[PDB]
C-alpha cells in the first residue's frame, strides 16, 4: 500500500509485456506497419501519467485478498488488471484532448497534435480502449471473476461516455448556458465523467479479483468512492485555472471552452451583479484577454482560498464517512486513496 | 432467408426497443438531458442503412438452428444480436466520416457536420459502440453463448481498428505512397477494416446463438466470408468513384484523401508511364479539378468494364468455393449473402 516507489517500479515493469501482448511482439503478423505503429501509440499515450488508478487496483487487491493468496503470480494479475484501467484512462484522454482542443498532456503535445495523427487519434482512442478486453481474455478468462470484470468495464465505459456528453453540453450557439451552471448539474457531470472510472472501477476490480461479490460490500465501497470522485474532479478544475503547467503537464482550457467547472459554479454563487455581467460577457470566449479577465475575477472572489478551505472540510467529511464503513472492508484502503490525492498540485 | 420485405419489417420492429433499453425510457435517470440526446444519436446514426449485417445475423441463425427451436422469442434474440452488429456499424461510420472528411451518409449530413456535434461525434462514436455490450448483458447473460459472443465483438472491434489504421497510412507529407499501393496491401486493409465485422461477425454470431462451437465449422465459414468481404469492399471502392450519390446516399472522397482503393491499385497496374505521371501529380489532392482528372483517367483505362468483369469472375469463383464447404454448414446461407450484394449500386 501507500503508493511507494517500490509499488510504482513493480507496476511499471509489467507495461512492456502489455505492449508486447497488443502488438504481437515475437509473433508473425500480416500487418506489421500497424502493430509497429500501435506500439508507439501505447508508448506515447498510456504509461507517463501518475498511474493512480492502476496502482489503486493493485493496492485494493493487496488489502482485500487473504495474505496467503498474495503470490507473485496473483500480484502480477492485479497489476495487469491495473494496466487495463490505465488503457481506459489513455483512451479517454486522447478523445478528451480532441474535444477540449487541448495543447499539452503529461508534458508533451496532445496525441492529435502530433505529425500524421490528427483525426486518426479518434481510431487510436477506439483501438486503445478495445485492447484492454484482449488483455482481460489472455490472463483472466479461466477465473470466476472474468464476466463480472468484463461487465464492470462495459458499464463504466458507457457511464463515462454519458458524463463526457453532459460535460460537452455546457455551450450552445457559442455561448455558455450560465443559468444551468448549478452544483446539481456539476455533481451529475463529475459522477459520470470521472467518479465511476477513477475510483469505483479500481476498487471493484480489486474486490472481484479477491472473489468478493457481496452486493452490500460493493454498495458501501461505491458510496465512499463516488464522494472521493467528486472531490478529485473539483481538484482537477482548480488545477485547470491555477495549476503550474510544468507540474500538472497540461495547459487549462475550461474558461475558453465555457465548461461547467467547480470554479465557474462557485464564481456564479459568490458574484455580485457586476461580477455576473463579467462572466456573461467573457466566459467561454476564444480571446486570451477574455480568459485573463475571468482568472482576475476568480482571484478577486478568493476562489483559491475558497477551494483550499473546501478541500480541507471535504477531506474531514469523507474521513467521517469512511469511519462508518462496516463489513470486512478495510478503512485503510479508502484512507490511503484520500491521502494520495489530498492537496495534490498535479 | 432471402432478405425479404417481411424479414426487414420484423427486424425494424425491434429497433425502438433497442433505443428504449439504451436511453432508460420509462425509468428514472438523474441525467435526462444525455439520455434524451442519446435517443437522437441512435435514431440518426443506427437504423437508416441497408441493415445487411443485422439481417445476415438473423438469416444465419434461422438457417443454422434446428427448426423446432425457431420460436418467436429465439428469432427476436437473433434480431437483437443483429442490432448489436448495426450498433458497431453505426459507431464505425460516425468515426470513419470524421477521418475521411465526408459530406453525406445515408442521404443526410455526416453526424459530425450537424449543429453542436463536431468533435462530440468522437464521444458519440465511443458511446454507440459501448452500448451494444449493455444489450448483450440484458438478453444473453444467462446463455452458454454469452462469453463467446462478447469475446467475438471485442476481437472484431480490435481487428477493425487495425484495418482503419492501415487504411489511414495511405498518405505521409500530404502525398499518397503510390509505390506501396499493391494488391497485397489492398487485401490486408480490407481483411481488417471490412471483412471481419461485415461477414465473419454476423455468421459466427448466428452459429453461437445456435450453440455451434465446432472450430472446423467456424474456420470453413471464415474462409468463405473473408473472400466475400474483399469482394464487398471492392464494390464499395467502385461506388466511391462511379456511384450515384442519390442511390448510395454518400459522396465519394477516396481520390481526394489519396486512399489505397481497388481503383487506385488497378489504375497503377494498367497505367502507361504518362498515366502513372497523372496519378503521381493529381491523386490525393484537395482541388476538384485534380479529382476530375483522376476520374477521367479511370474512364480512359476502362475501370468500369474491368470492375464489371472482375465482379462476375469473383462471383463465379466464390460460388465454386461455397460448393466445397462441408460439415452441416448450409451452402444456401453463403449463396443468399452473395446474391444480396452481387451487382449492387448501393
Ligand atoms: C512531465 C509532466 C509534468 C507530467 C505530468 C504527469 C501527471 C501529473 C499526470 C497526471 O496523471 P494522468 O495523466 O493519468 O491524469 P489524472 O490527473 O486524470 O489522473
Ligand atoms: C436515402 C439514401 C440514398 C440512403 C442510402 C442507404 C444505404 C444504401 C446505405 C448502405 O448501408 P450502410 O450505411 O450500412 O453501409 P454499408 O454499405 O457499409 O453496408
Ligand atoms: O477536465 P476534464 O474532464 O476534461 C479532464 O479531467 C479529463 N477527464 C475527462 C473525463 N474525466 C476527466 P482533464 O483536465 O485531464 O482534461
Ligand atoms: O471506404 P471506407 O472504408 O471509408 C467505407 O466503406 C466505410 N468503412 C470503414 C471501414 N470499413 C468500411 P465508406 O465508403 O462507407 O465510407
Ligand atoms: Mg480535458
Ligand atoms: Mg474534458
Ligand atoms: Mg480538467
Ligand atoms: Mg469512408
Ligand atoms: Mg474510411
Ligand atoms: Mg468507401
Numbering used by the authors:
A (entry chain A), B (entry chain A): 84 to 429
Give excerpts from the publication:
In this complex, ZOLAl displaces GPPAl, and the structural rearrangements prevent formation of the allosteric specificity pocket. However, GPP still binds to the HAl site by inverting its PP moiety and exposing the prenyl unit towards the protein surface. Taken together, GPPAllo represents a competitive inhibitor to IPPHAl that stabilizes the open state in the presence of HMIs.
Here we characterize a metal-dependent, bifunctional isoprenyl diphosphate synthase from the leaf beetle Phaedon cochleariae by structural and functional analyses. Isoprenyl diphosphate synthase in P. cochleariae (PcIDS1, EC 2.5.1.1) produces FPP in the presence of Mg2+, but preferably forms GPP when exposed to the heavy metal ions (HMIs) Co2+ or Mn2+. Inter- and intramolecular cooperative effects in the homodimer strongly depend on the provided metal ions and regulate the biosynthetic flux of terpene precursors to either biological defence or physiological development. Strikingly, a unique chain length determination domain adapts to form geranyl or farnesyl pyrophosphate by altering enzyme symmetry and ligand affinity between both subunits.
